[PDB]
Amino acid sequence: MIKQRTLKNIIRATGVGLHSGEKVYLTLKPAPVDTGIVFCRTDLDPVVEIPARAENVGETTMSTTLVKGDVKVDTVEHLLSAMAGLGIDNAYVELSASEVPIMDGSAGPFVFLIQSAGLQEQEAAKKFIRIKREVSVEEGDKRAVFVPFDGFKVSFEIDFDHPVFRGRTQQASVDFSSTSFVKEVSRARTFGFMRDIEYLRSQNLALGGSVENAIVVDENRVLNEDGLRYEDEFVKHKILDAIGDLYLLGNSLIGEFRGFKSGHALNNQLLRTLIADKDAWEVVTFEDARTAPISYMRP
Ligand SMILES: CS[C@@H](Cn1nnc2cc(C#Cc3ccc(CN4CCOCC4)cc3)ccc21)N(O)CO
Ligand SMILES: [Zn+2]
């Protein structure tokens, strides 16, 4: 069977919240079968526990925020993308502050931390959610859609309001094999335009931003000394974001996501619309990994 996965070992990181500028201590702890990904704030008493689920999303401005009462965990999208990409089912994420650290602005550092700690296969079938029918949300010219697909595929188009490298649009389609995430998506950094960033900074937002954790685009050219990691790093980063939001379903998807200008807010609306449309999906397991539509890397 395709088995659930957790971490072999506890692993620890430190970093800064890009939004908050706060120093945060991050601990990833192994968890047992059918735990899911569960966030908790170690700096509160009592400690509060928030499953990484669509129903616990409270804010979607610039990032996905988990909320339970007045306790928040901000910027979950990059870490959840790493845990989706590697097929982690079960883990505790323990934070000393209200925001996941930004690291280098990609999922790369999280993937390496997880893959260092090692993956542990567990004696329980991994659960998948199979898209059996098309489900779409729109807001003006923005679109997000789930369509049936025997595997996992993301198609994404961004549409800037001015040309960047001579075009307003950037498109990528990734049909995921076991290695696609690590090779072609995980290293894609977050980005902003210099005028947007200066405005955000003025409003006391993006207090942990730097060239070390974000691509800065000064109108139509990249400011960062060493340039881009991928030709279309920007759309690859939006694919990373969508993968992190998708994992809030709490099980791995069999199907295709297609986004046109779809950010955390519309991605979250698509999740809620899919969940409400129960005839469009079904939970499934694969007792034979060899006949499954998805395969993960060896543990
Ligand atoms: C979780 S990130 C999010 C998208 N997002 N939301 N807010 C963001 C802010 C930034 C930033 C920035 C930044 C600020 C200051 C500097 C330094 N200065 C520059 C040059 O001049 C002087 C020195 C550098 C860079 C980048 C991405 C952002 N996201 O991907 C959600 O998914
Ligand atoms: Zn992002």
Swiss-Prot record:
The keyword Zinc applies. InterPro entries: Ribosomal_Su5_D2-typ_SF, UDP-acyl_GlcNac_deAcase, UDP-acyl_GlcNac_deAcase_C, UDP-acyl_N-AcGlcN_deAcase_N. Keywords: Hydrolase, Lipid A biosynthesis, Lipid biosynthesis, Lipid metabolism, Metal-binding, Zinc. Zn(2+) binds at residues 78, 237, 241. The active site is at 264 (proton donor). Its EC number is 3.5.1.108. This is UDP-3-O-acyl-N-acetylglucosamine deacetylase. The gene is lpxC.
